[PDB]
Design a protein around this ligand. Structure first.
Ligand SMILES: C[S@@+](CC[C@H](N)C(=O)[O-])C[C@H]1O[C@@H](n2cnc3c(N)ncnc32)[C@H](O)[C@@H]1O
Length: 252
């Protein structure tokens, strides 16, 4: 309830990102789909097929039930397995692969990233898109130097301290009110990701902050913002949102 505005913003930004790169009849691969909280959005986008994969079976179960009890016009496929740290082959390619708030979990180890990036590339049609919303390392480290790493909504803690380079930390503890609790998150090594994808044929095409994206997309057209309880984010709510950023790659 206290995080309603934050959830509306994230869902909005997600709907805008989805509406920006998807077209009628497209096939989508939702990595880390979770409880399938995007099935509604894709249903509006008019996509023809949706495939959701998540490591947590408890979340896939919710998504199955939701897809089962929703007025959808597209075929749905669900599978509970590790799509990042384990070889995956669904046997087909998709026009768009989305990963909202979960791809950073692919940065467990160099091997986990290489495996994950390879799974995305073999399931992406030539000219296909790979959309994602992941935490921003630069943003996080900047707030570390500022001394403010939390408020009434979130809380972040880094790794070591005793003679340990600030740029050396590769993971942290994230906590969100009425959500994750002291969850282990892995930093996103942008450079390694870019170079890694560039090697598989995927090039970077977009990278924008949640706030700027939020404001821009919210002005480009009119209130779709009317639908959801959107409006004016407070400074405190903006700190939680201003944590993530949008990143898009295209298979050239
Ligand atoms: C914040 S939740 C996603 C919620 C949903 N995507 C959305 O945008 O509302 C992150 C998800 O990442 C998934 N995840 C974490 N590690 C994963 C892995 N190795 N393979 C697949 N999914 C993974 C979890 O099971 C969790 O449901």
């Amino acid at each position: 309830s206290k995080t309603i505005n934050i959830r509306n913003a994230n869902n909005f930004i997600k709907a805008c990102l989805i509406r920006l790169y998807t077209k009628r009849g497209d096939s989508v691969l939702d990595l880390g789909c979770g409880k399938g909280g995007d099935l509604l959005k894709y249903e509006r986008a008019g996509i023809g097929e949706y495939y959701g994969v998540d490591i947590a079976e408890v979340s896939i179960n919710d998504a199955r039930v939701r897809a089962r009890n929703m007025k959808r016009r597209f075929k749905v496929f669900f599978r509970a397995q590790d799509s990042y740290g384990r070889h995956m082959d669904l046997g087909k390619e998709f026009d768009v692969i989305s990963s909202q708030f979960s791809f950073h979990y692919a940065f467990s180890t160099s091997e986990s990233l290489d495996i994950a990036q390879r799974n995305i590339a073999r399931h992406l049609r030539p000219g296909g898109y790979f959309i994602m919303t992941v935490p921003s390392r630069d943003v996080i480290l900047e707030r570390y130097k500022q001394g403010r790493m939390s408020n009434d909504f979130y809380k972040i803690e880094l790794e070591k301290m005793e003679d340990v380079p600030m740029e050396s930390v590769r993971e942290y503890r994230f906590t969100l009110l009425d959500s994750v609790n002291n969850c282990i998150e892995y930093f996103v090594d942008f450079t390694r990701m870019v170079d890694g994808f560039k090697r598989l044929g995927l090039s970077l095409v977009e990278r924008k902050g949640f706030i700027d994206f939020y404001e821009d997309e919210g002005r480009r057209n009119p209130e779709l913002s009317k639908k959801m309880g959107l409006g004016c984010l407070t400074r405190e709510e903006s700190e939680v949102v201003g944590i993530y950023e949008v990143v898009v790659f295209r298979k050239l």
